[PDB]
Design an enzyme around this catalytic site. Structure first.
Site, PDB file in Angstrom:
ATOM      1  CG  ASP B  79     -13.324 -27.735  14.212  1.00  9.34           C
ATOM      2  OD1 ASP B  79     -14.142 -27.838  15.177  1.00  9.34           O
ATOM      3  OD2 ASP B  79     -13.279 -26.715  13.507  1.00  9.34           O
ATOM      4  CG  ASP B 255      -7.033 -23.690  15.805  1.00 11.47           C
ATOM      5  OD1 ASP B 255      -7.012 -23.542  14.563  1.00 11.47           O
ATOM      6  OD2 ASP B 255      -8.046 -23.450  16.496  1.00 11.47           O
ATOM      7  CB  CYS B 293      14.895 -17.706  16.719  1.00 10.15           C
ATOM      8  SG  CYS B 293      13.923 -19.186  16.406  1.00 10.15           S
ATOM      9  CB  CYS B 295      14.297 -22.550  15.523  1.00 13.53           C
ATOM     10  SG  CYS B 295      14.626 -21.769  13.907  1.00 13.53           S
ATOM     11  CB  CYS B 298      17.579 -18.734  14.077  1.00 16.88           C
ATOM     12  SG  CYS B 298      15.998 -18.177  13.373  1.00 16.88           S
ATOM     13  CG  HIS B 324      11.785 -18.842  11.963  1.00 12.34           C
ATOM     14  ND1 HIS B 324      12.628 -18.561  13.015  1.00 12.34           N
ATOM     15  CD2 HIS B 324      10.913 -17.810  11.888  1.00 12.34           C
ATOM     16  CE1 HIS B 324      12.305 -17.386  13.526  1.00 12.34           C
ATOM     17  NE2 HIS B 324      11.257 -16.917  12.868  1.00 12.34           N
TER      18      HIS B 324
HETATM   19 ZN   LIG Z   1      14.361 -19.442  14.171  1.00 12.55          ZN
END
Ligand SMILES: [Zn+2]
Ligand SMILES: CNc1nc2c(CC[C@H]3O[C@@H](OC)[C@@H]4OC(C)(C)O[C@@H]43)c3nc(N)[nH]c(=O)c3cc2[nH]1
Ligand SMILES: CNc1nc2c(CC[C@H]3O[C@@H](OC)[C@@H]4OC(C)(C)O[C@@H]43)c3nc(N)[nH]c(=O)c3cc2[nH]1
Ligand SMILES: [Zn+2]
Lengths: 358, 358
Positions: B79, B255, B293, B295, B298, B324
């Site tokens: 920015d 963002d 999820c 990820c 998880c 996460h």
């Molecule tokens: Zn997750």
């Protein structure tokens, strides 16, 4: 299928040893550093005192035990909880310790039998006897009275452990030597523990403010009193140089909150000693935290960037510091094991100190 | 060899678009979420305002630029610094903004030319014009005066960017539309920016307290005013539901500090809405943070364990929450891109809201 517990010594140099502990959930290479689980390592530490207040040992057992809870299927060691109760909570008697929880105000008693049951509910693989960590300094009379109670409590710990089939068949029990800095009491304690019989033996009552010279002096006569053919665990130790000197004196296992504590407060361990990464001298330093470290932090990021993150209050900075510190400790232990195995540990210790203290 | 900048639209559904921005350092899939770099993503955000105070833009350049500094070789967006100066530091004039640093007390001026030079020293790939983020609410007269100054500043930003060969040949410059909530001023701003010519166009002056209904109302007429064939960046947005609705209105880039901020304060994003993991209802919940999820958190750990870590003050807990949350946002953007590409984004948005708000 691995045994419940088997310690083998593969190589020796002076009083130093290197080998393995085989347990059902994995092999532990010794000398071993055992990091806090909530911070590679072969075994981690659970925090008995915290877990018995939040969520409670019964609740951990309901959730499947600490291995499932933490997602860690390898060995776990738990302390017996009394050191912490006596450090962070109290009324003492021959039965145990009574104390009130700062978390919720509830009352709690801890005894040898309850400590063993809590560690059973947590599901740990290495269980510590319930002992009294004698304050330092102590008079000969107070040190003896405390040691004698801890030995009675060691027998009660042994009996409680043996009464729980799942525990006796799958876990291991370590006794803890006490006696403060006094050779005759350390000897009486060792004798009492060997007569009861344990899978391993811890040197308790040190790293309580006595300083390295005194600690090493007590280790000099205390470790030879323990059975040679069983692991020796120095509780609470320590700085990298404490570990090297303790290995030189026959210690096989270590725990210490310094890697994680330091990593939260800006301190990184390096082969050239500790550094405080927040210091302005690192703001333009493009070298990794340590120039030899194999860890993923030192592979990718500079001192200048980690300095920036920590100064900015970014969580990433503390996590990278902690990762580096835990990795440094495991690299130190690997170099210790390899040098003992290769018959050059005496030279390693000398080279380590010359550089670490330069 | 990729071009300096090329935006291609691969598929459309209503006002929503999906495609790619190709830059020298990588491809950006749109719609894109652009996380803070110091928190997978195709582009990250640098913090111009912080970096110009610590260590300083010249110092970052001496250390090799932000890519080398952070260890990130893909695109970086910065920015222009005025929003932050006007938020966290001040004296305004047609030249720029004067302000004093809380860090060290020193004085700083920020102008279009200095902002562009700072972003050049940082080495970012997408450079924002130096604008005034009009406060909310604003009267028509104040909103117009502010927008008109921002357009003069947009031309000065364009000229400064074009004067730096390395920047003009390797980076891209985005103009920022202002005009508060007023359709005629948003139109004048769009016209002014298109006459100057930019690589992409941001919708500025929103996510400043107006609320989602008003934000969507302003997006409804504002985004069609921008060139259709260039990316549209909604600055500061936002919650998952803000992102879905903004994509429905033609936004390509986002963002927001919420994933990282929430992850530091106990809040996890899930397909069933946000949850506060510190709440006691999660203390025995063995499900992962989100049941779908992909990820790594998880995959391995429960709500109960993350609850435990955060309640204990362990840094590991905040890091797992943040991992996460950032992963959730990237999964949301992947599902948005795939559904637009497949012609089922309208259904996705409806299904998303029914479940997220259940
Ligand atoms: Zn997750
Ligand atoms: C720091 N020096 C030090 N620590 C000692 C401990 C363990 C203290 C436990 O509490 C925390 O301290 C540590 O983190 C966890 C993982 C909670 O475990 C450690 C001891 N424990 C027992 N049972 N008996 C002792 O004589 C003893 C002596 C110690 N000296
Ligand atoms: C929260 N809503 C919101 N943010 C806005 C911003 C960016 C503000 C920057 O500062 C931090 O806030 C964010 O984290 C980093 C990475 C530092 O960048 C962001 C804007 N920036 C410019 N130049 N012009 C605008 O009209 C504008 C409007 C905004 N509305
Ligand atoms: Zn390292």
């Amino acid at each position: 299928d691995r045994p419940r517990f088997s310690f083998s010594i593969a190589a020796r140099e002076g009083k130093a040893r290197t080998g393995t502990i085989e347990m059902k959930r994995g092999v532990i290479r010794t000398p071993a550093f055992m990091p806090v689980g909530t911070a590679g390592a072969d075994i981690i530490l659970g925090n008995t005192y915290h877990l018995m207040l939040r969520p409670g040992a019964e609740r951990i057992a309901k959730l499947g035990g600490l291995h499932s809870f933490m997602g860690w299927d390898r060995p776990i060691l738990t302390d017996s909880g009394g050191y912490q109760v006596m450090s962070l909570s109290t009324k003492q008697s021959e039965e145990g310790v009574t104390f009130k929880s700062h978390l919720d105000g509830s009352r709690h008693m801890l005894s040898p039998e309850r400590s063993i049951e809590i560690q059973h509910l947590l599901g740990s693989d290495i269980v510590m006897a319930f002992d009294e960590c004698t304050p330092y300094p102590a008079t000969p009379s107070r040190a003896a009275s405390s040691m004698e109670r801890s030995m009675r409590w060691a027998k009660r710990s042994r009996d409680a452990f043996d009464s729980r089939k799942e525990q006796a068949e799958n876990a291991a029990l370590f006794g803890i030597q006490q006696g403060s800095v006094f050779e005759n009491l350390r000897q009486q304690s060792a004798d009492a523990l060997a007569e009861i019989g344990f899978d391993g033996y811890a040197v308790g009552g040190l790293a309580v403010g006595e300083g390295q010279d005194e600690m090493f002096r007590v280790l000099d006569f205390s470790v030879p009193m323990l059975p040679d053919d069983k692991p020796h665990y120095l509780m609470g130790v320590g700085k990298p140089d404490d570990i090297v000197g303790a290995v030189e004196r026959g210690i096989d296992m270590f725990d210490c909150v310094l890697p994680t504590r330091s990593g939260r407060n800006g301190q990184a361990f390096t082969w050239d000693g500790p550094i405080n990464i927040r210091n302005a001298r690192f703001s333009e330093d493009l070298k990794p935290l340590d120039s030899e470290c194999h860890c993923a932090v030192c592979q990718k990021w500079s001192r200048a960037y980690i300095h920036h993150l920590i100064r900015a209050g970014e969580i990433l900075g503390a996590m990278l510091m902690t990762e580096h510190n835990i990795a440094f400790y495991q690299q130190l232990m690997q170099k210790i094991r390899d040098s003992i195995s290769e018959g050059r540990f005496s030279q390693f210790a000398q080279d380590f100190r010359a550089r670490y203290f330069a």
